[PDB]
Design a protein around this motif. Sequence first.
Motif, PDB file in Angstrom:
ATOM      1  N   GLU A   1      14.207  84.064  15.978  1.00 12.56           N
ATOM      2  CA  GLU A   1      15.449  83.308  16.104  1.00 12.56           C
ATOM      3  C   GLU A   1      16.360  83.586  14.917  1.00 12.56           C
ATOM      4  O   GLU A   1      15.935  83.490  13.764  1.00 12.56           O
ATOM      5  CB  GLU A   1      15.190  81.809  16.195  1.00 12.56           C
ATOM      6  N   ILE A   2      17.593  83.997  15.205  1.00 14.94           N
ATOM      7  CA  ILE A   2      18.563  84.283  14.154  1.00 14.94           C
ATOM      8  C   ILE A   2      19.754  83.366  14.334  1.00 14.94           C
ATOM      9  O   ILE A   2      19.937  82.773  15.399  1.00 14.94           O
ATOM     10  CB  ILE A   2      19.047  85.758  14.150  1.00 14.94           C
ATOM     11  N   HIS A   3      20.546  83.231  13.279  1.00  9.31           N
ATOM     12  CA  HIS A   3      21.714  82.370  13.323  1.00  9.31           C
ATOM     13  C   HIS A   3      22.906  83.127  12.766  1.00  9.31           C
ATOM     14  O   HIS A   3      22.872  83.621  11.639  1.00  9.31           O
ATOM     15  CB  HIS A   3      21.438  81.109  12.512  1.00  9.31           C
ATOM     16  N   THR A   4      23.936  83.277  13.593  1.00  8.36           N
ATOM     17  CA  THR A   4      25.162  83.984  13.220  1.00  8.36           C
ATOM     18  C   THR A   4      26.294  82.991  12.933  1.00  8.36           C
ATOM     19  O   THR A   4      26.215  81.820  13.335  1.00  8.36           O
ATOM     20  CB  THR A   4      25.584  84.974  14.335  1.00  8.36           C
ATOM     21  N   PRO A   5      27.363  83.441  12.247  1.00  8.71           N
ATOM     22  CA  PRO A   5      28.493  82.566  11.905  1.00  8.71           C
ATOM     23  C   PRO A   5      29.333  82.058  13.077  1.00  8.71           C
ATOM     24  O   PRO A   5      29.549  82.806  14.047  1.00  8.71           O
ATOM     25  CB  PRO A   5      29.320  83.427  10.965  1.00  8.71           C
ATOM     26  N   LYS A   6      29.792  80.812  12.971  1.00  9.75           N
ATOM     27  CA  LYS A   6      30.623  80.167  13.986  1.00  9.75           C
ATOM     28  C   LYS A   6      32.091  80.280  13.585  1.00  9.75           C
ATOM     29  O   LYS A   6      32.986  80.086  14.407  1.00  9.75           O
ATOM     30  CB  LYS A   6      30.240  78.695  14.169  1.00  9.75           C
ATOM     31  N   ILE A   7      32.333  80.541  12.300  1.00  5.89           N
ATOM     32  CA  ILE A   7      33.683  80.707  11.773  1.00  5.89           C
ATOM     33  C   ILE A   7      33.836  82.199  11.511  1.00  5.89           C
ATOM     34  O   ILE A   7      33.142  82.766  10.673  1.00  5.89           O
ATOM     35  CB  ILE A   7      33.896  79.902  10.464  1.00  5.89           C
ATOM     36  N   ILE A   8      34.726  82.830  12.267  1.00 11.20           N
ATOM     37  CA  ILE A   8      34.954  84.267  12.163  1.00 11.20           C
ATOM     38  C   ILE A   8      36.414  84.636  11.897  1.00 11.20           C
ATOM     39  O   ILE A   8      37.323  83.850  12.147  1.00 11.20           O
ATOM     40  CB  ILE A   8      34.472  84.997  13.456  1.00 11.20           C
ATOM     41  N   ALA A   9      36.613  85.835  11.363  1.00 12.00           N
ATOM     42  CA  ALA A   9      37.942  86.362  11.060  1.00 12.00           C
ATOM     43  C   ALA A   9      37.966  87.812  11.514  1.00 12.00           C
ATOM     44  O   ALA A   9      38.930  88.535  11.283  1.00 12.00           O
ATOM     45  CB  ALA A   9      38.218  86.280   9.566  1.00 12.00           C
TER      46      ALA A   9
ATOM     47  N   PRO B   1      24.961  73.823  13.947  1.00 14.67           N
ATOM     48  CA  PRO B   1      25.900  74.128  12.856  1.00 14.67           C
ATOM     49  C   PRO B   1      26.711  72.921  12.424  1.00 14.67           C
ATOM     50  O   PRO B   1      27.128  72.127  13.256  1.00 14.67           O
ATOM     51  CB  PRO B   1      26.863  75.157  13.458  1.00 14.67           C
ATOM     52  N   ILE B   2      26.939  72.789  11.123  1.00 11.75           N
ATOM     53  CA  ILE B   2      27.765  71.709  10.587  1.00 11.75           C
ATOM     54  C   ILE B   2      28.762  72.372   9.641  1.00 11.75           C
ATOM     55  O   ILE B   2      28.444  73.381   9.013  1.00 11.75           O
ATOM     56  CB  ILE B   2      26.949  70.616   9.866  1.00 11.75           C
ATOM     57  N   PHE B   3      29.965  71.817   9.544  1.00  2.61           N
ATOM     58  CA  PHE B   3      30.999  72.420   8.711  1.00  2.61           C
ATOM     59  C   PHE B   3      31.579  71.496   7.640  1.00  2.61           C
ATOM     60  O   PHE B   3      32.019  70.373   7.923  1.00  2.61           O
ATOM     61  CB  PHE B   3      32.096  72.980   9.612  1.00  2.61           C
TER      62      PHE B   3
ATOM     63  N   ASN C   1      29.923  76.470   3.233  1.00  2.00           N
ATOM     64  CA  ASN C   1      30.872  75.776   4.091  1.00  2.00           C
ATOM     65  C   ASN C   1      30.456  75.700   5.560  1.00  2.00           C
ATOM     66  O   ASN C   1      31.116  75.077   6.390  1.00  2.00           O
ATOM     67  CB  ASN C   1      32.252  76.402   3.908  1.00  2.00           C
ATOM     68  N   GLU C   2      29.336  76.329   5.870  1.00  2.00           N
ATOM     69  CA  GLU C   2      28.801  76.319   7.216  1.00  2.00           C
ATOM     70  C   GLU C   2      27.296  76.312   7.037  1.00  2.00           C
ATOM     71  O   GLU C   2      26.747  77.104   6.266  1.00  2.00           O
ATOM     72  CB  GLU C   2      29.229  77.560   7.989  1.00  2.00           C
ATOM     73  N   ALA C   3      26.630  75.399   7.730  1.00  2.00           N
ATOM     74  CA  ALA C   3      25.188  75.276   7.619  1.00  2.00           C
ATOM     75  C   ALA C   3      24.561  74.816   8.921  1.00  2.00           C
ATOM     76  O   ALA C   3      25.252  74.507   9.889  1.00  2.00           O
ATOM     77  CB  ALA C   3      24.843  74.289   6.503  1.00  2.00           C
TER      78      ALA C   3
ATOM     79  N   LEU D   1      22.042  84.704   6.999  1.00  2.00           N
ATOM     80  CA  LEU D   1      22.585  86.040   7.231  1.00  2.00           C
ATOM     81  C   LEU D   1      24.036  86.291   6.820  1.00  2.00           C
ATOM     82  O   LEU D   1      24.331  87.207   6.042  1.00  2.00           O
ATOM     83  CB  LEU D   1      22.408  86.412   8.707  1.00  2.00           C
ATOM     84  N   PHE D   2      24.950  85.511   7.380  1.00  2.00           N
ATOM     85  CA  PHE D   2      26.368  85.683   7.086  1.00  2.00           C
ATOM     86  C   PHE D   2      26.937  84.388   6.510  1.00  2.00           C
ATOM     87  O   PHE D   2      27.507  83.558   7.226  1.00  2.00           O
ATOM     88  CB  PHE D   2      27.104  86.136   8.360  1.00  2.00           C
ATOM     89  N   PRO D   3      26.761  84.197   5.191  1.00  2.00           N
ATOM     90  CA  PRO D   3      27.211  83.034   4.423  1.00  2.00           C
ATOM     91  C   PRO D   3      28.710  82.811   4.440  1.00  2.00           C
ATOM     92  O   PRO D   3      29.498  83.745   4.318  1.00  2.00           O
ATOM     93  CB  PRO D   3      26.730  83.358   3.011  1.00  2.00           C
ATOM     94  N   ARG D   4      29.097  81.555   4.601  1.00  2.00           N
ATOM     95  CA  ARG D   4      30.501  81.183   4.605  1.00  2.00           C
ATOM     96  C   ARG D   4      30.766  80.452   3.286  1.00  2.00           C
ATOM     97  O   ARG D   4      30.260  79.347   3.062  1.00  2.00           O
ATOM     98  CB  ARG D   4      30.807  80.284   5.803  1.00  2.00           C
ATOM     99  N   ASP D   5      31.482  81.136   2.393  1.00  2.00           N
ATOM    100  CA  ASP D   5      31.848  80.622   1.071  1.00  2.00           C
ATOM    101  C   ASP D   5      33.276  80.138   1.070  1.00  2.00           C
ATOM    102  O   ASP D   5      33.981  80.214   2.058  1.00  2.00           O
ATOM    103  CB  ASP D   5      31.813  81.740   0.021  1.00  2.00           C
TER     104      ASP D   5
END
Lengths: 438, 438
Positions: free
Chosen positions: A158-166, B211-213, B225-227, B428-432
Motif C-alpha cells: 500500500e502506497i500513499h500519493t499526494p492529494k495536493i498537486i501542481a 489524508p488531512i490538511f 502540510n499533508e498527512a 513518498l511525496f512530502p508537502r512542505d
Amino acid sequence: MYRTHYSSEITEELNGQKVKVAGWVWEVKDLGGIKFLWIRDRDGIVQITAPKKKVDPELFKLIPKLRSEDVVAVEGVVNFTPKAKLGFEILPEKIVVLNRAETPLPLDPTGKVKAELDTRLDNRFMDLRRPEVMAIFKIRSSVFKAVRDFFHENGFIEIHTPKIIATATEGGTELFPMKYFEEDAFLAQSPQLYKQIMMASGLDRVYEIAPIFRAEEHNTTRHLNEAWSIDSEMAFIEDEEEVMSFLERLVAHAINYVREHNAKELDILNFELEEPKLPFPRVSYDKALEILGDLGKEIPWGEDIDTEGERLLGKYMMENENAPLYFLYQYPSEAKPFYIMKYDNKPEICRAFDLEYRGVEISSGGQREHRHDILVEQIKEKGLNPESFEFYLKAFRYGMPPHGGFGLGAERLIKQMLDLPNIREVILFPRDRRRLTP
Amino acid sequence: MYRTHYSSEITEELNGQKVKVAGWVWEVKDLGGIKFLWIRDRDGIVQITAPKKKVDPELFKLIPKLRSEDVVAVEGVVNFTPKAKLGFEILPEKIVVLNRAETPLPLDPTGKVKAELDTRLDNRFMDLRRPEVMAIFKIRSSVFKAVRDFFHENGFIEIHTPKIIATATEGGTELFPMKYFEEDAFLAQSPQLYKQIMMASGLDRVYEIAPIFRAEEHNTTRHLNEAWSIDSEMAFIEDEEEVMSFLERLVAHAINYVREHNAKELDILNFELEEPKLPFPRVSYDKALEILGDLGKEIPWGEDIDTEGERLLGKYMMENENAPLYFLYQYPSEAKPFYIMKYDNKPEICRAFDLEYRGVEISSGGQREHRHDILVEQIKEKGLNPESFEFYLKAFRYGMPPHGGFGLGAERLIKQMLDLPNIREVILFPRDRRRLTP
C-alpha cells in the motif's frame, strides 16, 4: 463500558448470566402486570422483560417513562425462552438513562414515513438507525477490507500519493483549483502518474485507496465530486489481460466476502447477490459497437460508448450471458489516454479496458506505454506538451519495466453491487455541485 | 508475467527447477570464460552465472552488453551451492532486456555518493532502489495493515468522511481555504465533527485512515502540510481511560507486527524496535509540569509543554521508566478543544490526553462532551458561534451516547517508531511550506 454484549453476541452459553447491554429505546410496552423494553443496537434489538413481581419497583415505574430514541443501559440476567421472539430476553436489575432524546425526530427511524434523500443526508446520524441503511455501510466497510486483503495476499504494497498537486494532467478541468500559500495547486483526481512513476522504483505491485476530487458541474446518480478510488499498478506484465485477470479476481473476492459475512445485511436489503462467475466475458469495442448498432444505438467508430450504450450493453450481456460483470476492451487509441500502450500490430486500437457492473463502468485501466520515446510521441499526438510532464517522463528514462494497472471506483462498485439507484446511498457525506454540508 | 519468483521466495524446495526472475541490472562480471549477472529485486539480489561451456552463445555475448539499471528478465534453473554468497544462483536459459537505463542516474543506487534529502525527494523512484529506503516504505504499509487488522478484530467499522468542508470546526488558520464552486470551503484537518455525528448513528466503533490538511507557516522535521491520520471514535465509554487503553493496545499491536514481519527491514535499518510493554505510563499534566520543574524547565500552569519540554519529558520517561511511549493527560481545559469533556469535579482540568513516542506527540484524544447544552456552552467559551455548528450539534439532540476517540499521526507514528531524524523520510511525496512538486 456501558455494555458487555451486543444483541448478536448473546448466545446460549450466557443463559442465566448477568450481562450489560446498551442502545436506543426502540419500543416500550406497559401492559400493566408486565412491561417490555426493546433496545436497539447496531446489530439489532434486545428484549428486556419486566414482570411486576420479578423486578425492582422503582424500575417498574421507570420503564413507562422512557421515550423513543433515549440512550439507555441495562444490566440484567439473560434468559433463554421460546416466549422471546429473538430466543432470549433480559430480566433487568438496573436501567440507566444515559441521554434523553428530543422530539420530534428529524427522521422516522421506524421507517413508516419515508423521507427525501436530502433530508436523510442532512440527518445521517438518524438515517443509519434504519437497518437497511446501516446494512449498506457495514457492506461498504467489508468491501474495503476484502479488497485490501486480496492485495496483500498477492504481494501488493500500500502506497500513499499526494492529494495536493501542481503537476500537469491530460485532462485540464474538473480539477478543484486551490492555493498553496504563494503557489497555485489543485486537488488530485487520480494517482495515475505517481503510481506509474513508482513502477520505476521496484515496489512492483502497489495499490492505494484514497479520495479523489472532481469538480463536475452536473449532478448524476453515478458520480460525486469527492470519491474513494482503489488504484493499483503492477510491473513486469506481458499484456493488459494480466491486469484484467487480477481485477476480475479482486472484484470476485470482494463480492464473495460480502455474500459470506454480510448475509444478514443482504437479507435486510432484500437483495440476492450473485456468485461471481469467472472469467467475466470480454467484449471488444468493435463487438460492442456492432451489438449497439443493432439496438439502434449508433456510435461512430472512434468516439466512446456513452451512458445509454453502457446501459444497453449491460442489459444485452445480462440476457445473452447472464453476465452482471463484463469487460469492454481493445478501445480505439484516439479514445484513450496518452499513457495507454497501443497494439504494435494494430496501432489504431489500444490495450485499455473498462469493467462494467450492471451496465455501469466501475473501473478502467490497461497496459501502459513504458517506452519513453513512444510515450513522448503519444503525448504530442494528444496535442499536449511533453515538457509539462518532465517530472513523470524522467521515471521512464532509467530502467522502466512493462506495467499496467486500473482505477476502481469504490462507491460505484458498491452501488452497482447492491444494485442501488443513487450513489448518495453508499457514501455518508456526499459532495455535490449543490451539496457542501454537512 | 516476466517473473515467477522474487529473490526472497527462492528456497531449497525449488533446487533444480526452472524459475523466472526479473529486476534491474546490479552488477556484471564479464570474464570471457564465464559471465556473472546480478539483478536487483524489490527484495534483494540474485546471481545469474553463465559459464561459457554451459550457456547459449548468444546469451554469453549479451550479458556484457547489459548496463546498470537496465530492466531484465531471466528464465533459468535454480542451483543451490556454497559457492554462491547468497546460497544459490540461476543458470540462464533465456535473458530479455525489457528496458535500458540512461546515464547518468539522478541518484546513486549503490549508496556510494550520498545525496541531500531534497534531491532524493525530487527522485523518489531512484531513491526507493536503495534497500534502506524501500525498508521504510514496506514498514509503513505493514503499520497500516496492522492498524486496520486491530481495528477490525475489535469490532470497528471503517467509515470515510469529507475532505472538503465549509465547517470551521475549532479554529484559526492553518487551514487550506478552498473554493467549492460559488461557496468557499476548507480542506479538513480532522474528521472530528463527522466522527462524533456518527456516534449518534449507532455505528458505535468507527475508524478512518485518510489524508488531512494543515497550512503551517513553518517547516519542521515533525510535520507536513499533508498527512495521513488514523482517527477513531467509540461510544458507551465511561472515561478517557477506555480510549487510552484501546489506543495503547493498537499501537503495541502495530509495533509488534513490524517486529514479526519486518524483522529483515529492521536489520537493513540496523535498528532494534523494542517490545511494547503495556500499560504505558500515564503522566498527568500537573505531574509532568513538576517533573520539568526538577529539570529546570518552568512552564506556567495552563500553558502548553513546548518542544523542549516534550523532549526533556520523553528523555526522563525513557531513562527513568524505560518508557519510550507514555500518556500525558488531565490537561488544562483552557488548552484543549470545545468538544472535550471537563472533569465535572475539577472543571479547570479536562479528559484530554496525548501519546508521546520517543518524546514526540504522535496522537491526541479524549472523552468528548456529549451533553448538548454544556457543549454549546463550551463552543461559546471558545469564542466560536454555536450556529455555525448546526449540522454537528443537531446530532447531540436525539440520543447521543457518551463517547471518545483519538487522532493518530501515521507519519509521526512511523517516524518515531524507527527513530528517524526527519518525517519526510516516511512519506513518498512530502508537502512542505516550500514543497509542492513533484
